[PDB]
RNA sequence: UAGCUAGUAGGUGGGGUAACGGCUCACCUAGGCGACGAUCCCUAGCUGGUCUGAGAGGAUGACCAGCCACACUGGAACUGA
RNA sequence: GCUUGAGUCUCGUAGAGGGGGGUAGAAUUCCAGGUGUAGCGGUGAAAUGCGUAGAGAUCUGGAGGAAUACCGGUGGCGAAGGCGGCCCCCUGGACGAAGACUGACGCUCAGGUGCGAAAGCGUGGGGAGCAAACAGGAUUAGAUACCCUGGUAGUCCACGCCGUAAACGAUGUCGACUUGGAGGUUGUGCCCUUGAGGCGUGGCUUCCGGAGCUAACGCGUUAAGUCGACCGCCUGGGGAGUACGGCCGCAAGGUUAAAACUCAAAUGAAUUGACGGGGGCCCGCACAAGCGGUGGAGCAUGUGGUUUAAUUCGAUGCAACGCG
RNA sequence: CGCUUACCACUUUGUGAUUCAUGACUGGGGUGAAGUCGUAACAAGGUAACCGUAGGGGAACCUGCGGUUGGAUCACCUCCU
RNA sequence: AGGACCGAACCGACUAAUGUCGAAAAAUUAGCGGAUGACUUGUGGCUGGGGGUGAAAGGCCAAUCAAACCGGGAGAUAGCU
RNA sequence: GCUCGCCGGAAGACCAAGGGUUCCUGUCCAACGUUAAUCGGGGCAGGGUGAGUCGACCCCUAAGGCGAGGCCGAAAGGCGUAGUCGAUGGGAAACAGGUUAAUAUUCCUGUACUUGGUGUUACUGCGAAGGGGGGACGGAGAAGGCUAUGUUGGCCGGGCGACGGUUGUCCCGGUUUAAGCGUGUAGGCUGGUUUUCCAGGCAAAUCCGGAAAAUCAAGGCUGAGGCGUGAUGACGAGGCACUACGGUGCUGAAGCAACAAAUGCCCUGCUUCCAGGAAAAGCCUCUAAGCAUCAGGUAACAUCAAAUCGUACCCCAAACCGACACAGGUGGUCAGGUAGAGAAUACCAAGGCGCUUGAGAGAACUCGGGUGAAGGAACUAGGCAAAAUGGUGCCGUAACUUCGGGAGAAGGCACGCUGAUAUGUAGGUGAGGUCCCUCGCGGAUGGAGCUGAAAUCAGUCGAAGAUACCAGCUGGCUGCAACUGUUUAUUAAAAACACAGCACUGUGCAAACACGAAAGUGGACGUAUACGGUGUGACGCCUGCCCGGUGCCGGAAGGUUAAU
RNA sequence: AAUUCCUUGUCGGGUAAGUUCCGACCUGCACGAAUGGCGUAAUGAUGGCCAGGCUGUCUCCACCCGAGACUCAGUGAAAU
RNA sequence: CUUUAAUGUUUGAUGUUCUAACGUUGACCCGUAAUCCGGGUUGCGGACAGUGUCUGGUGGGUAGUUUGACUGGGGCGGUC
RNA sequence: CGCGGGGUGGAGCAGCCUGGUAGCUCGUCGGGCUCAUAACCCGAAGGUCGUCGGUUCAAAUCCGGCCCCCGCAACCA
RNA sequence: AGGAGGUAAAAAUGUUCA
């Protein structure tokens, strides 16, 4: 729940937390882990390509299953685990045979729900089945782009994908952004919206709160000198340039959309 | 103006006043007052009577007269019934 | 002690009373596919807007959100606000019945507590339509309006807050008594149900009116009639339901609540008239159906104005202007 | 008697409450024969009014929502044996 | 619980004096700020010159930075001394 | 050698790093030392570093580096798969005493332990670059159980004392003991056991995991410290004894209890929150391709092996880094007595030092400080600097407010010592005795001893009782920025930057963007409740008018319009 | 006004005296609503102002204890 | 000539479909215990995308440079 | 620079591919409008339709050459 | 008797005193 803290001190007076007692408080499941070192925004060359990245709490990568290629096998959601690499929660599923995996936690979910995957599973939140078996107009998530890629669209807290039309070979999805892109009918998708939908309401409150997230300080252009940023200079807070990126590319209304090989799949762009 | 009092509510003993009594000390009990209005603030001498009013009341308390308080301001005491 | 007060029990009745969970149909909007072509949408007229990228129209399928056609009624329920597609679960009250039981437990009620339309507010979702604010188009002397195309918050759901309305039958509550008629609505008794029924007895309610009452209008067995019990409130208008303080509130403010000053009116019902871009009937060269003129030209003449030593004076909507 | 002690007023120091004048200045209000702009209400006031409430606006007031009547008018033209 | 309070270690460096051919090529003394955090620190790596890095001063990049150092162009050029 | 002063959470004692013989002894004084110098980190010569258990090498990985083929690029070269390196990380095993001029958990005495090679004996199925378990883990907080360690008492030894008292409640000193083995406690964790079956674990599996039955209720794992043993041993104050007078040999009693108590250990625990907290190998176990009179494995025993390098000295400094024997810097460990909350501070212990120029004088002037009559900011750019306040407990505490604060606001009262309440209380700890028992390191009851706040009353001394060191100045008006925080190292610490929050906009994944000739990477093993860019900068009330200039987005028919 | 040149604007308070300060008037040379506007509890080694306390800051310096200065002995620079 | 309708013809384009070029940061198999790579199946796009050559536009992101003299000091003014 | 395009009462804009009609509105004179004003409804000023020439029954119009404007690629004494 | 469908765009203002 969105618990509003008390103003006992500066900094703690604005922080808004999201508690979740339904979440199992124990240590993570060992069989599905491996190290995940930070990169700090440094590529092969070592130079910082993406800025504002560094620090943050150490965390391990939990190999969650997006693919879902297990058919005709019922699974039981054992318990909900907290995933530091996502925005949404993850349920630790336990299959009938005994192999365990993680799946993005859908909305209506608790410890003990029954799910399965295939091409015959009934329409119930948590089941994975191709997008031709799923009725027109339903709400899905974790939609796969290529028939076997794994899962691309709708992978964050509270997001979903609405199948709008199945024109035979393809399936038109009404994306989260208002985008309407056609995807193959053979692509696997999982029903129901993604849980932990109140993640958005959480505020960080402190400047250091953003630090342990991983976000490093971001300096404004007018605070710099002429050589570091196209804006800079001035005797005191002067402007007069046209808003751009640190590398000359115009911002504030400037489309960078240009691929032309994917222009076949888009019905209506975001407005 | 909604809570107020802390020798303050009462009791015991000593003392104290012409005399009763927290009137004053020590100890014990934790009570006492309060919406039929405590405390607080503002105002004011009260009355017998007076002016008016059909009566009921309203306003008021100068002159006559009974009582209370003060005597530059405040505190204290003696004398003496 | 008792019982005509009040309260309780057994059997049932009517109902948008209230809370929660699902479900159904119509329509609007949006979307995909097929058909198909220059309009579509809108107005007092017009335009912004939409459309030859292929709309509107139509058919199929889908998605959502809010409201529930007809039933439906000055009909019903509830204290009031308010509440209606349907089904289930929990639950409140009122009412009728033939008896019994307790035996005044009663009525009212400053303070205090709870509920309390909409608008608005905080947190979280949702978001079709409608639509503050806003945008453009028109209209217009101006139009930051009425009209139109779009459109955010809002309107809907959950948890809290706010606590105000012409919250009004402008009528506080309980109980008793005081001629009737015409209906609705809901129990129940008896007689031949001898047929769409007939005669009584309660609850609630609609209209008209007697007594009576009132300033009148009007209320009139649900009373503003006749009385009693208890509570809130008012003492000219404005100032002002405002100032200051307290309390409550996230905020917007709410609640409690004066004085100074100024005026001598403010206010109600109702009458006679005048008026309305109110209604109705009737009348006239009023309009309509026509004919010939005026204004345009020249000129006679009157007048205003201008001019002038003076161009006497007056008249100057219709009702001055070939008038005195 | 002097000294000392308890009580004690005048008085001082620090910090609150309440109240009266004064206070540059400012909001609103009342008022003043013959000002300005607009025309909001009064008939259906020419978009019905008013209450509550939100937002907007040179002024009145305009718009949305719910509510109330302290709002007027229901005569004329096409269908039926 | 806390980018919470007081305050040593530790980190930092606001005021003043000394020092300025100094004890030192930015310290000492007496006072200051943070001190469970955006903390500090060891060891070890990575990013490079029109490039790096920068809670952004044109600051730092080996006592040197509006473009590091070394070597080579190169005995650059100098209407100047 | 005798007095004296200083540090004592260091100016003490040890490692890593880093230096490189500076360590020790003999001898020498030109140069070096800021003076002299028979002295020394200086010269010359000689001597010194002893390891199966310490560290490294070694085995295994992290960041990251190199990188067969490979992809890519004028060449150089770049990136990267398998692999292979890379600790500050994980992994086997030792403690006490003695000895040297210098080294020793290394040599000697004593008592132990670990991992492998081979052989013997009795049994048994063993066997991977493969699977599972383990290794393997965050921050903060509270408590309990103990220990290092210290104090007091008892006991033993020496003294009874150069000025008054001191055979007594007296004084001084000592009262030390590990590794390993056995028990398996305080405490914590987990419900154990057997059977059957199975689309799972790149193949298989008796092992892991899962699904239903049966049976009993505990079993098992882990674990500081204590107690025995180690040890009728060593050590040990003090004597007995020779002096090259530095020291050596010899001997050697007491060696317990109680209380207080860590930041050490249990704890790689437990509770809670969120920002959600390495990897691989060692080790245990199961099987595949296979191999079974074998080979190997389990257990016991015998014996052998444990190699190579470092090891001296300095390590908060005259030996490192700063040109110096430089008032600077340098990570980690132990850290005692009294007062005290404390690792502050004051004085001391162990231990180590008096900082490598001194002797006189007692001027102006300067630095570092002490005190100051009367006044009290009049000084001055400005209360800059000094002065002053300063602790604990209790009482009491305004405007304003985001209802947390403001606030330790402000301003006052009591503070020493002695006795009594009480031959030291409340409280803590707690032997003996007694009883019971699923008998052990048990549980109740029990109360001596030990230790020990604070409050009240009375008395007493001084000018002052938080007496020293130590240790807030407070209040009012107001600009700016919300606040913690960051920055011009070496003149600027601020109102500048950052900041959570807010808005616009870009991005549909081979994502935008960025580094890079390219490949490939970061973004992200994330995917619109996400990420990038820009602007403003908590929170509250809001955030107006203008689309011509410029930029961007959208419709492009017409005009012009390159290459071809 | 961190913005007002003219200017030490004018009025009131604060002082014996106030170009600074505090509260207002609008004549805004040349504020202005995310290059955000106006407020705002707490916080600040922040800027300006006032009062108390406190004092050698100062009136007006005086005295004293240490380290140099000075004399002697030894070593022995520098800028110019 | 203005305006236009059918046809043939000459080209620029557009629509749609297909699979063999090409892409494939889809799945699967093998080289191989290796998320690179290469090849083989197969799915999805598809003559697009993307790359080279030439060319127009934009382009302070980057680079090389210019920005006069006289002047009763220079700048402004004015002049040549 | 060679293709385009445009000049209209005092000002602002149609008329322009089709020739024959120099108009629509703001502003100024007035006339109506009502009992009055404002408002609107309306008539008239006043434009060498850039200059000049050229086709034709006839010119802003269709045509030309030259002045004046503004949008394009341009331009190496 | 008993009940339905269709039917009005725009026009402000008029000194005080009596």
Give the CA-to-C1' distance from A25 to F111 in angstroms.
51
Residues with CB under 7 A from strand E: A 8-12, 42, 45-48, 51, 54, 206-209, 211-212, 216-217, 219, 223-229
Q: Residue A141: what are its φ and ψ, rounded to 5°? A: -155, 170
Strand E: which positions are within 7 A of a protein CB? 1-4, 37-39, 46-48, 51-58, 67
Q: DSSP string of A191-232?
A: ES-BS-TTGGG-B--SHHHHHTTTBPP---GGGS-TTTSSS-
Q: Report the alpha-carbon distance of residue A90 to residue A106 in Å, rounded.
A: 8
Q: Domains of chain A, with CATH numbers?
A: 1-113 (2.40.50.140), 117-194 (no CATH), 195-271 (4.10.950.10)
Q: Residue A106: what are its φ and ψ, rounded to 5°? A: -75, 180
- Determined by cryo-EM
> Residues A142, A66: contact at Cβ < 8 Å?
yes
Q: Report the alpha-carbon distance of residue A173 to residue A140 in Å, rounded.
A: 9
Residues with CB under 7 A from strand H: A 146-150, 169-170, 184, 186, 227, 230, 244, 247-248, 258-261, 264
Q: Which residues contact A186 (CB under 8 A, 6 or more apart)?
A: A130, A131, A132, A147
Q: Is A64 left (phi over 0), alpha (psi -120 to 50) or beta?
A: beta
Tell me the nt nearest to A67, Cα to C1': H27
Give the CA-to-C1' distance from A269 to F467 in angstroms.
85
- Report residues 56-75 of A contacting strand C, contact meaning Cβ closer than 7 Å: none
Residue A137, CB, less than 7 Å from strand C? yes
The two beta strands, A2-4 and A128-130, are unpaired
Q: Which residues contact A115 (CB under 8 A, 6 or more apart)?
A: A74, A75, A76, A77, A93, A103, A124, A126, A127
Q: Which residues contact A137 (CB under 8 A, 6 or more apart)?
A: A162, A163, A164
Q: Report the alpha-carbon distance of residue A134 to residue A147 in Å, rounded.
A: 15
């Amino acid at each position: 729940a969105v618990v509003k803290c008390k103003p006992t001190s500066p900094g703690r007076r604005h922080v808004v937390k999201v508690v979740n007692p339904e979440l199992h408080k124990g240590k993570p499941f060992a069989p599905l882990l491996e190290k995940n070192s930070k990169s700090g925004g440094r590529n092969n060359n070592g130079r910082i390509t993406t800025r504002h990245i560094g620090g943050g709490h150490k965390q391990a990568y939990r190999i969650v299953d997006f693919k879902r290629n297990k058919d005709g096998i019922p699974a039981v959601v054992e318990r909900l685990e907290y995933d530091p690499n996502r925005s949404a929660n993850i349920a630790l599923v336990l299959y009938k045979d005994g192999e365990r995996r993680y799946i993005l936690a859908p909305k209506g979910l608790k410890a003990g729900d029954q799910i399965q995957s295939g091409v015959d599973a009934a329409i119930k939140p948590g089941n994975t089945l191709p997008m031709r078996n799923i009725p027109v107009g339903s709400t899905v998530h974790n939609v796969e782009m290529k028939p076997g890629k794994g899962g691309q669209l709708a992978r964050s807290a509270g997001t979903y994908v609405q199948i709008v039309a199945r024109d035979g070979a393809y399936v038109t999805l009404r994306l989260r952004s208002g985008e309407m892109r056609k995807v193959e009918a053979d692509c696997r998708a999982t029903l129901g919206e993604v849980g932990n939908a109140e993640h958005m309401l959480r505020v960080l409150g402190k400047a250091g709160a953003a630090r342990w997230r991983g976000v490093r300080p971001t300096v404004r252009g007018t605070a710099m000198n002429p050589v570091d940023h196209p804006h800079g200079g001035g005797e005191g807070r002067n402007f007069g340039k046209h808003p751009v990126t640190p590398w000359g590319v115009q911002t504030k209304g400037k489309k960078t959309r240009s691929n032309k090989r994917t222009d076949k799949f888009i019905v209506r762009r975001r407005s």
